Every structure is written in structure tokens, then in C-alpha cells.
């Protein structure tokens, strides 16, 4: 879209409707007259535009009013209210802008941020931008969280986030304008190649991909139409639904053969019954023609009864010769209705091995998108965030995605090698105890008004707790923690001294022989300037291949590559790197997913702050103390970077609203 409407769409907001959020801050406007709503909406949509036009400078309130045209520039408190709500919630003045008004001299409140992951950094920057005192505790010796960028010499390859899922509505778009990022488009062509080392033929590849998507659309209708959502009092997974749909197809192939062969027996039996009538007439004809021959033996003249016996047996035989001719006539129609059927058989199988091993690859692709076996995904809800898909080409950050967390970290109080250990949240405030990861022995105490927790969902799931909450988290939160899915997906990175692949195609598939191995090294990426190939390990293979040494894995990797491109064009790799994200103590997995029995409403429970009980009995209900950000908290944008980012912007506004107050709501 274009104009002030495009500003709204690039900020993930309807340009012509007020949101639930703004209903909250502007309940006067919303319950008011249709004209005022339009004014606000223009004022809103206008403002994002000026921010979106130049996102490298702060968009001050005075600036906005200056550039607003009458009649809109007329009501200033409305313009102030809007500009302040926008600034608070990170729709404008977020990321890395030059500040016009300088940061307040003395601050207000103290927030401790667990994790300098992207969601972590996101909040930190907003909070500091709002005049708060912010410190981040990070267990790693670097800032990226699950944005992890390998670098050696000229080689560069993300073991974590790799792909911007298109700038159409993406807050990542604003960051890239502010930040040096080399954004490179990913061209969509993805050749598959079966276990032999030779391409799938275009015929096969379109017939399976189409059947896959057909199977998917089926499951959707089991879910939503037929209401197939419980089976022996467990939830249905996308996996089960997929098998029941394939089993239904595999059944239908067999009714179609059965009904068609049953057509053959219904006519081969009419033939039998007709051949019988035709032998029983050649028999009557045989005996009649005899009788006629004995009756012409009497030689003429003969009396008239003898004359009629010759004449009779003649009619009677010509008549039986008519009846027999009408019957090998009809024997002609049936005998060819039968070379007809036997010529058109229904198809012999539903799917052959070569088909199913190719259909498996599209399941590996789903298991990668969710970082989990389809047997764990929720049927109803796995795709529940599809509505908020961005538009545009997906992209890669060619100088490494880490250049974004790094850029964000500039200006911030960040403590590294600081493993948080216990979070104490009380009516009066918060202490967080951390140890130093190197010399476990050096212990740290951090006191603050509130804690923002961006700990990865897998870390939070750890049994026994890698982090103690004091007091324990309430049952409603810890139940959402189990129900939620945290899955796995790993990456193998191969650096070479020469381009041996097709340099003008960014990706390509490998097809697995087994259903089990369908995840194992099933997808390759040519993405960076250096000669680097990068391979995915998803599905059930994800967790397995962590147990196996790099060398064995780089083995199977170079093996698959040799089959594809020839055992003499594939050199020894110069440097190799295998990820292990479930093993990583600070990750414990790759990203979240809507597990069976979960919903995306668990994402929302995940993001609900915690309010400790009173210190003194009968003292009044406190101010919330413990907040939650990160990809596993943002329902409409799960498991991505831009979602983490968004969640951090979210909490930061919510905290500031609870601790600096919201002048913009009167």
C-alpha cells in the first residue's frame, strides 16, 4: 500500500479502524463520534509515516505538529496524546535513532533485564530511551541470544536466525534502514534431489508438492469443519491428522480399483450367460439342420405334410439362425466393452516409495518451520499466526545477522558471563542473584523495581530449574510453560575454497530414504559471498544428530553433496561448524511452537506480568514486578526475530506505563 495507509500497514495496524490497544488509551475517542475517530486515525497514520519516512532521527512531538496540516494540527492535546502513545509502544522512535532532546539527566526506576537476546535488547533500548536505569544480565559472552553468527576469516554464516521473512509490515525493515545490514533476496527456486544424487523430474516434483498441499488443506478441514480434534482423549497432532488423511486416500485408491474390477466381473458374467445361450443354440441348430436334411431325403413329389416338414424345419432353422446372429452381435458389444475397461484401470497405488520419500521432504520442510516432529504440533492451532505473515521476498543478512543485536547493544549496560540463578520478586521490589559463568564462585546481587525476563522458553522449561523464582511462579503460568512447545533444529556449515554448486540458486533439497531420516541434512543454502554451503537438520533428526560427532555429520553432508555434484568436484571443507541448540544451556532448543494441547492463547499467558502478594498482611495489592518478553511471548509473531523484537517493545512500554505513568490516557 501507498500513502498514510501504507504507513499503517507497515506498522501492522488497520489504517481505517482503531485497535484494541488504542481503545484502551483513547476510550474517549472510540466511544465518541465517527468524525473524531477519523481525525485520530489520520493523526495516528500520518505520524507513523513521518517516522517511517526518516527512521534515523527521533520524531519529536513538536516535529509532528509542525508537519501536520489543518484541520488536524488544530487540536494539540490529541496530537500530543497520539504522539505519546506511539512513542510509548515503539511504533515510532524505536531502534537506533539520533536523539534530538537528550536523555534525561537523572533517571527513574531500575529495571534488570534477564537475557540480552534480541527481545532483551529491544526493551533495554526503549526503557533507557524513556529515562529509566536499565541493566542486562547475559549468561553468554556475547549479545545475540539465538541470533548467532559464525565468523572466521572471510567466512560468515548464522547458526541462528538467518532469514528476514519479508519486509512487508516487518519492524525489521525499520532496523535495516537505521543499521548497516546487507539484505540479500532469496530466489525461490528449490530443486530437490533424491537419495541417488540426481534431480527429481519436473513431472514428479509438481505432482507431489501439489498432493502435499492438498493433504494439508485436508487436515485443516478435519480440524475446523469435521471437528476432528480429540482421539482416545489426547489432542490430535498435525501428524496424526496427516496419517488419517493419507490412510483415507490410500483407502480411496482401493475402492476405485474394487469398483472397476467389479465392473469387469459384471460383464464377464453377462458374457458367460450369453455364451451359454449361444452354445445352446448351436446345439438346437445342429439337431434342426440334421432333421431338415433327413426330411429333404424324401424326394419330391411328396405329400403335403412331408412338404411342410421340409418347409417347417427350414423356417425353424432360419429363425434359430436369426436368434444366434443377434447373439454374436451382442457378444460383439460386450466383448469390446471389456477391452474397454481393461484398458482404463484406475491408478495402481496411492503413492509409491519414490513418491512418499518425496512427500516426506515436504514434511521435513514443515518440521523445520516448526522445529518439531509433526506428531507434537497442534492440529487446530499450529498455523494460528499465518494471518500476520509479512509480504515480500524473504532475505538474508549477508554480513551476518549478529550485526543487528550488536548494533542494538550500543550504549547499554550489559553484564556478560552473568548467569542469573534466582529471581526474587516482592511487594517492595526485586533481587536477582547471578553467578559468574567463568569462576562460578563470584556471586552477584542485583536490586531493582522490576525484572524483565527474556529467558528462552526452553530454559524456563528445564527440569530441574536452571533459574529459581522466589516466590514460585503461579500455577497458571507454569502450566502454560509445560503446554507450550519448544522444539529443535540445527545447522551444519561447510566452508570451501571454491564454488562447486550452482552460484545462481540459493537453496536446494536432499530427499531422505527413510521417513525417520527425513529431517537429516534435508535442505541446503548458498547464501553468503564466501563459498559457504549450509545444511539444515530438522525434524526428529534434529535431536539425534547432536549425539553424533561433527566429523560423522560433515561426513553424511559431504556424502550427499558428492552424489549430487560428483565425487571429484567436492573438495575437503576448509572450516566446519555444527550447531547443537538443544544442548546449549542458554537456549535448550531452537524456538517455540504450538504443541498439541496448546493454543496461541498460551503465548498470551506467557506474556502476562506477575504481581507479588503483599509484604504486610492486609497491605494493598502491589504493582506488578516481573515481566516477560521473547519470541515465546508474542502470539501473533511466534518463533521469529521480528517477534522477539516486537515483544521487547511491548514489555518496555508496559513497564514504563506501570512505573512512569501514562500521561497520554486522560
Amino acid at each position: 500500500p501507498s500513502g498514510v495507509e501504507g504507513a499503517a500497514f507497515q506498522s501492522r495496524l488497520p489504517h481505517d479502524r482503531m485497535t484494541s490497544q488504542e481503545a484502551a488509551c483513547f476510550p474517549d475517542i472510540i466511544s465518541g463520534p465517527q468524525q473524531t475517530q477519523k481525525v485520530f486515525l489520520f493523526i495516528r497514520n500520518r505520524t507513523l509515516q513521518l517516522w517511517l519516512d526518516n527512521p534515523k532521527i527521533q520524531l519529536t512531538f513538536e516535529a509532528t505538529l509542525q508537519q501536520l496540516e489543518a484541520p488536524y494540527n488544530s487540536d494539540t492535546v490529541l496530537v500530543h496524546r497520539v504522539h505519546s502513545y506511539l512513542e510509548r509502544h515503539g511504533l515510532i522512535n524505536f531502534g537506533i535513532y539520533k536523539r534530538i532532546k537528550p536523555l534525561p539527566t537523572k533517571k527513574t526506576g531500575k529495571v534488570i533485564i534477564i537475557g540480552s537476546g534480541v527481545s532483551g535488547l529491544a526493551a533495554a533500548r526503549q526503557l533507557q530511551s524513556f529515562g529509566m536505569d536499565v541493566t542486562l544480565l547475559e549468561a553468554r559472552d556475547r549479545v545475540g541470544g539465538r541470533v548467532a553468527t559464525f565468523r572466521k576469516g572471510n567466512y560468515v554464516a548464522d547458526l541462528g536466525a538467518m532469514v528476514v521473512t519479508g519486509l512487508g509490515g516487518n519492524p525489521m525493515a525499520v532496523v535495516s534502514k537505521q543499521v548497516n545490514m546487507e539484505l540479500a533476496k532469496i530466489k525461490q527456486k528449490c530443486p530437490l534431489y533424491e537419495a541417488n544424487g540426481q534431480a527429481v523430474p519436473k513431472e514428479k516434483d509438481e505432482m507431489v508438492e501439489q498432493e502435499f498441499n492438498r493433504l494439508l488443506e485436508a487436515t485443516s478441514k478435519l480440524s475446523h469443519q469435521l471437528d476432528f480434534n480429540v482421539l482416545n482423549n489426547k489432542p490430535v497432532s498435525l501428524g496424526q491428522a496427516l496419517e488419517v488423511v493419507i490412510q483415507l486416500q490410500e483407502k480411496h485408491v482401493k475402492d476405485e480399483q474394487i469398483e472397476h474390477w467389479k465392473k469387469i466381473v459384471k460383464t464377464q458374467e453377462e458374457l458367460k450367460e450369453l455364451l451359454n445361450k449361444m452354445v445352446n443354440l448351436k446345439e438346437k441348430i445342429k439337431e434342426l439342420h440334421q432333421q431338415y436334411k433327413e426330411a429333404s431325403e424324401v424326394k419330391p413329389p411328396r405329400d403335403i405334410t412331408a412338404e411342410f416338414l421340409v418347409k417347417s424345419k427350414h423356417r425353424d432353422l432360419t429363425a434359430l439362425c436369426k436368434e444366434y446372429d443377434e447373439l454374436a452381435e451382442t457378444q460383439g458389444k460386450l466383448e469390446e466393452k471389456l477391452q474397454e475397461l481393461e484398458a482404463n484401470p484406475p491408478s495402481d497405488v496411492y503413492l509409491s516409495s519414490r513418491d512418499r520419500q518425496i512427500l516426506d521432504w515436504h514434511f521435513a520442510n514443515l518440521e523445520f518451520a516448526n522445529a518439531t516432529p509433526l506428531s507434537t504440533l497442534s492440529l487446530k492451532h499450529w498455523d494460528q499466526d499465518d494471518d500476520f505473515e509479512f509480504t515480500g521476498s524473504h532475505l538474508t543478512v549477508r554480513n551476518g545477522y549478529s550485526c543487528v543485536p550488536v548494533a542494538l547493544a550500543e550504549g547499554l549496560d550489559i553484564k556478560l558471563n552473568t548467569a542469573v540463578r534466582q529471581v526474587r520478586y516482592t511487594a517492595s521490589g526485586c533481587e536477582v542473584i547471578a553467578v559468574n559463568t567463568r569462576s562460578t564462585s563470584q556471586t552477584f546481587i542485583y536490586k531493582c523495581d522490576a525484572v524483565l525476563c527474556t529467558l528462552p522458553l526452553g530454559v524456563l522449561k528445564q527440569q530441574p530449574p536452571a533459574v529459581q523464582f522466589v516466590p514460585p511462579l503461579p500455577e497458571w503460568k507454569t502450566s502454560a510453560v509445560q503446554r507450550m512447545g519448544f522444539g529443535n533444529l540445527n545447522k551444519v556449515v561447510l566452508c570451501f575454497d571454491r564454488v562447486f554448486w550452482d552460484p545462481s540458486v540459493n537453496l536446494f533439497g536432499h530427499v531422505g530414504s527413510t521417513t525417520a531420516s527425513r529431517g537429516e541434512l534435508f535442505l541446503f543454502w548458498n547464501l553468503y559471498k564466501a563459498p559457504i554451503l549450509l545444511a539444515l537438520v530438522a525434524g526428529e533428526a534434529a535431536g539425534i544428530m547432536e549425539n553424533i560427532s561433527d566429523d560423522v555429520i560433515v561426513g553424511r553432508c559431504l556424502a550427499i553433496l558428492k552424489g549430487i555434484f560428483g565425487s571429484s568436484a567436492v573438495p575437503q571443507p576448509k572450516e566446519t561448524v555444527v550447531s547443537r541448540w538443544r544442548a546449549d544451556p542458554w537456549a535448550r532448543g531452537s524456538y517455540s511452537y504450538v504443541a498439541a494441547g496448546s493454543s496461541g492463547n498460551d503465548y498470551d499467558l506467557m506474556a502476562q506480568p506477575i504481581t507479588p502478594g503483599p509484604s504486610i498482611p492486609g497491605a494493598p495489592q502491589p504493582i506488578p514486578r516481573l515481566f516477560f518478553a521473547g519470541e515465546h511471548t508474542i502470539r501473533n509473531y511466534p518463533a521469529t526475530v521480528h517477534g522477539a523484537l516486537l515483544s521487547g517493545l511491548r514489555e518496555a512500554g508496559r513497564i514504563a506505563d506501570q512505573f512512569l505513568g501514562a500521561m497520554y490516557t486522560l
Binding site: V163, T165, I186, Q188, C190, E209, F212, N213, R214, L215, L216, E217, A218, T219, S220, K221, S223, H362, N365, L366, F368, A369, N370, W382, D383, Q384, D385, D386, D387, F388, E389, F390, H394, L507, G509, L523, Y593, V594, Y637, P638, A639, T640
Partner: peptide
């Protein structure tokens, strides 16, 4: 989730 796919984005069950 589905959002996440680059290669051979899956369509069945999505609402165009």
C-alpha cells in the same frame, strides 16, 4: 510456524 518457511512455502490449509 508456517510463517517461518522460505523454501517451498506450504499452502494447504492457509486462507488466501
Amino acid at each position: 510456524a508456517r510463517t517461518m518457511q522460505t523454501a517451498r512455502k506450504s499452502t494447504g490449509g492457509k486462507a488466501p
